[PDB]
Amino acid sequence: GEYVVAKLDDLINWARRSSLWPMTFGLACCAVEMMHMAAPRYDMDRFGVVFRASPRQSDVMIVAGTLTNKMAPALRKVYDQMPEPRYVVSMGSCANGGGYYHYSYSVVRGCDRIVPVDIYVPGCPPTAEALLYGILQLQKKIKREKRLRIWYRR
Amino acid sequence: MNLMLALLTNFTLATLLVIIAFWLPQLNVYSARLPFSMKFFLVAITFLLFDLEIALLLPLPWASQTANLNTMLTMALFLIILLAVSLAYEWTQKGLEWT
Amino acid sequence: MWFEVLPGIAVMGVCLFIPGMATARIHRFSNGGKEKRVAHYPYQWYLMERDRRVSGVNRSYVSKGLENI
Amino acid sequence: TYKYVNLREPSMDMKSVTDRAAQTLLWTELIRGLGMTLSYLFREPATINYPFEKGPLSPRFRGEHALRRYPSGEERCIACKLCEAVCPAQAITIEAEPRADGSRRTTRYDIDMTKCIYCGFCQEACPVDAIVEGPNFEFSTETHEELLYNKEKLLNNGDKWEAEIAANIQADYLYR
Amino acid sequence: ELLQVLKRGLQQVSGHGGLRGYLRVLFRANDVRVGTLVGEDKYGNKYYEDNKQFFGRHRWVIYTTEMNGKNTFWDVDGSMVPPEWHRWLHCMTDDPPTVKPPTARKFIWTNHKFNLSGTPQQYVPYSTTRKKIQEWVPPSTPYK
Amino acid sequence: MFMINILMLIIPILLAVAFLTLVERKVLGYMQLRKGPNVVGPYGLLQPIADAIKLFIKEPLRPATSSASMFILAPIMALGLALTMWIPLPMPYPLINMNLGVLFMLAMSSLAVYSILWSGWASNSKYALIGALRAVAQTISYEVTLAIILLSVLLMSGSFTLSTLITTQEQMWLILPAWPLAMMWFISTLAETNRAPFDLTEGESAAGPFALFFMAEYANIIMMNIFTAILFLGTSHNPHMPELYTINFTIKSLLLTMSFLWIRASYPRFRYDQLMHLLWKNFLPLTLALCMWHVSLPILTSGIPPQT
Amino acid sequence: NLTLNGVLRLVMELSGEMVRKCDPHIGLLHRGTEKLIEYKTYLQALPYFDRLDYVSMMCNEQAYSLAVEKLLNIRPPPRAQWIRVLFGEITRLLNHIMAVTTHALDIGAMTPFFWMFEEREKMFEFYERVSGARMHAAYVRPGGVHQDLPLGLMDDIYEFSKNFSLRIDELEEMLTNNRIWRNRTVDIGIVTAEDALNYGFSGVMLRGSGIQWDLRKTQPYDVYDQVEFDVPIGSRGDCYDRYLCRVEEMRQSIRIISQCLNKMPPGEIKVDDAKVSPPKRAEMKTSMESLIHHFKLYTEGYQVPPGATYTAIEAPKGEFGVYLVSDGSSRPYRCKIKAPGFAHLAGLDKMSKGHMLADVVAIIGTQDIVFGEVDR
């Protein structure tokens, strides 16, 4: 029986990591490098990562740029409308911890004050390749998930 | 019977796919007036009236078999021209505008 | 390369070929190896019902020739 | 000097008027657009096969920081704090004292990698090539805390990457 | 020309050592090109080049199936490339470490490690300085 | 036996739709100097399976609807009608041989708009109901020319039986005498299916329900292009080798469907009022004039087709 | 009247299809850059300018560097000036590609974005090779540039430039004569010459309306007076003409880049004044004076004589300037950033009168708005 549960986890994990549909908050500079990840050289679509997805068909939110206090409530609302399972990738110093505006009166010091974060991509900005490395790292995180194995043991 | 079986299968399968879509183990333990233009209403009515004239034109492939071809062609062209006339009337009366 | 688009096109093409191929072969199976009779008008239906009676087995697609004269 | 982008008068000769009518009715310029996208269908794509293939970089690339050593193994950093002073983001925090052998060395060298803007000013300011931005760009983490580097982490980065870092410095130091 | 195109396709099956080896690289790397082997590192990664490919596709690595006790048959990672080959693979230099080896130092890691985030070997930050203020310790014996 | 036949039509349609999503992504990719899916299975061949499973285990997060009944009804109507459009298609033989198959498809396609309208009601959102009404207005408008164009073509064919279109085109494709109609027909099908450059529902603007609306819409895309092939690019039928018809007929449909992808990759989007003008002020005048012409043409050439 | 409600919040009043009022709500990317700059040395403040119009990085750097050099009363060496014009025009190509193809993608034409972003990727390589960063290079600095070009870079810029005009041609084939593209842009967002001036427009927002003005011609800086190029001028002041001006400006940028490559002179790359520009590392490690000056430039920074200057360049999006106030110390007292998009977006309501909702997307696109510079 546990053999069945192990293989269904593999199946659903494979499907979810193989069809990661992102919503990008293109907040600032870092949005440019995610555009270069979609561009032909890296072609995120070839991994199953569609270029643009609506928030309600999205699986991963990519916070790409500085999150201000004025924008923080809007970002939380979009996260709360994401169907589950949902993941958050924080990309760039600004989103990671405030970066170069960390000491500003108007900047949230890291988007993890507003939403939970699964992957932190460092850089100002991270290169398109560095972002792609972070996306592939999120895929490996999903591969490790054991939702049914843990469900069967409750 | 064949066609009813086809229709039943198509919509029964549609019903099944919709319900299984709505159901799955989630593994969890925890009347007024729209602010919408009168122009959009006029599109619907215009479609309706033209749709009624298309109904009158559908028999034309069969009507072309008649021996009264002179009458058939005159009435066929008459109906289309009047349909064109109503389009011309709407056009000139600013009825196909959106500004 | 562009010819890496073909495998997906081939699968979709095979999928769209089965309905036409299946219907044609199911018709032959069910009609004694012939095309399914088309009866769009009452005259064609009348002959099809007459064939059913003449067939002797209640199948309009079983044909009787001069052997039965 | 200037030029007009869109100041032209269409010819009204019947041959030209009919040319525009054919374009309107036969959609010729729309067909011409179809040819361009068709020609791309048969071009080789620009995509590379990451992570088996990598985008090209130069020796100047500014990646993950590391602290370096002299060939003997002694740390290059002498706790001068010029990197900390110039850092545009105040991402560097340093403390220092005399080492047991009396050497001038740091007891704290932290870089908040989520404050850092990866500008390279620290490695420009360093007088002994101690702090560098290395070539690594694939160090994303699962937690915020993992990006708060202390001296042990930065020294480990230097020992991990020195082979590449030294060769990159060798290729670019004559431009500095 | 179409016939010549097809034979090149078949030479990739043989260039990869037969049908099984052809399918292994197809499913591991999504690519069946055959290149010149430039070298191999101590972890089993193999490095290839084909200079007729456009810049960026002219160098690639086929990752080892095991590294530091981790099964990497399907789970490959860009951080698996050791620093000596990192420079060549990213075109920071022209010649590989087999032709211009890196300068040896005693303190340089002999064993490369890939990204360890999310494992029990992940880095955990902490303050590296000692306590600054020393508290007074009261005497052990009684005397009020 | 007939039950087997129904399933051998329904199931291949769903698989064809699933792999159309792969083909569209890869065709768009290469016209954009990239590859599109090529990791999930060889050449992306498992990408549609991954997407389908992922969508069906996603949280069916629907905010409260105005009416539960119409929330379920809208996608059932959409998918059910879409599968129903296929049963009269001669490929070369139809599942159901209808004497009025052409009129049957027109009737069934005119009901497809209800799924749009009911979605607007069930969204419980004023703004989603407005988008649904804008979509309905576009759809019914382009229904007008599709009906008239189809009528004009049938005047050279002689009946509403779909298989008679095969006989009509035994010597010659109908695209040759009717290329002006084929042009407007083809654009009308794009506007009818909300395809670029007419994809204004997306421009202006989950889980399984979303996947079902998507599947129905992509099944309509394939079916419209099959109907275009039958209507204008008639394949010759050899009664002793029906598979030869099916092969050639399928190729024409694939190329026509791929041209929808081609057109999406090539053009910007119409403004809403501009695609309304394209129909009411351009297509409809020509369609009316060409309908008059095609009523007169068989009579003045003594080329009236047989009634049977 | 139905009311609807980087990133932007648009509050609009609609009567049917027509926009009756358009009220942009910005500040969603306001990060108090100007206040932060007051706590930085002049060098420390330079990287902030990469992150304003973060599509035109070295043009923002040039504007700040020119302002500081003016207050310092120094000038960069000639080779630094030619490099700065060379990479200024490469940066204009980066911006115009982003402006035109995302303007196209926003209204459905998604394919040119992919073709031209492969070209952007190759230009990102030129930034990375001179500075080690693909975008925020921090390369252009007061006194000149940080480092000299690596050997073999100009040859590769020539190779890229030699083929680029064909890429522009492919873009024009997709858009210029397309009746759908023209329907979306012709007679959209018409702005009169006098309204454009009074509303504070600049750049292509002016030239699209026939105004003959370009700071590279009228008020030249660095070595722009030594290169030949034409200024494209519009005739209708609408989105389509501004689109044509931007496409033609890309062609003229290649024309300027060709001259920069051929006329690049030898010599040093930063001003030979170690009280402003740091000495070479080899000098820093041998000469006592050089080490002192390196130490002081990287801690206190150079002091700037007290004064104020408004300094402007012809950035890819329009006039970009700084009002920079020095109090005599090594930290600026006040730095006001004049972003061309600030005034342009302030005129969206005026431009969108009598248009439909879907045209507002086109008008925002023709203004070329990056909210890094609008919000600062």
Ligand SMILES: CCCCCCCCCCCCCCCCCC(=O)OC[C@H](COP(=O)(O)OCCN)OC(=O)CCCCCCCCCCCCCCCCC
């Ligand atoms: C002996 C005498 C015999 C008598 C009969 C003679 C008849 C022959 C003469 C008639 C020829 C008419 C051709 C009919 C086609 C429709 C023409 C048409 O409608 O074009 C006008 C329309 C709008 O054009 P526009 O620039 O906006 O200006 C007009 C309004 N001011 O333009 C458009 O429709 C643009 C469409 C936009 C969508 C573009 C996407 C499609 C592009 C690729 C299509 C490829 C063609 C497909 C072929 C069909 C495939 C089956």
Ligand SMILES: CCCCCCCCCCCCO[C@@H]1O[C@H](CO)[C@@H](O[C@H]2O[C@H](CO)[C@@H](O)[C@H](O)[C@H]2O)[C@H](O)[C@H]1O
């Ligand atoms: C096409 C046929 C495919 C057959 C595959 C059959 C596999 C059946 C196993 C399904 C496992 C689903 O796994 C589960 O999916 C639901 C989708 O909402 C997720 O979401 C669920 O849990 C989260 C919290 O964890 C809740 O907030 C949420 O309301 C709930 O929907 C779960 O986080 C995920 O653990």
Ligand SMILES: N=C(N)NC(=N)NCCc1ccc(I)c(Cl)c1
């Ligand atoms: N629209 C595309 N071409 N794909 C895409 N980007 N999203 C849609 C992907 C999709 C949706 C439903 C199913 I069922 C499947 Cl198999 C795949």
Ligand code: SF4
């Ligand atoms: S992390 Fe760097 S590149 Fe990204 S938004 Fe912040 S300053 Fe810009």
Ligand code: SF4
């Ligand atoms: S790279 Fe720049 S921001 Fe980062 S630590 Fe060095 S000086 Fe500070």
Ligand code: SF4
């Ligand atoms: S790293 Fe260099 S600049 Fe920083 S304190 Fe050490 S020696 Fe000084």
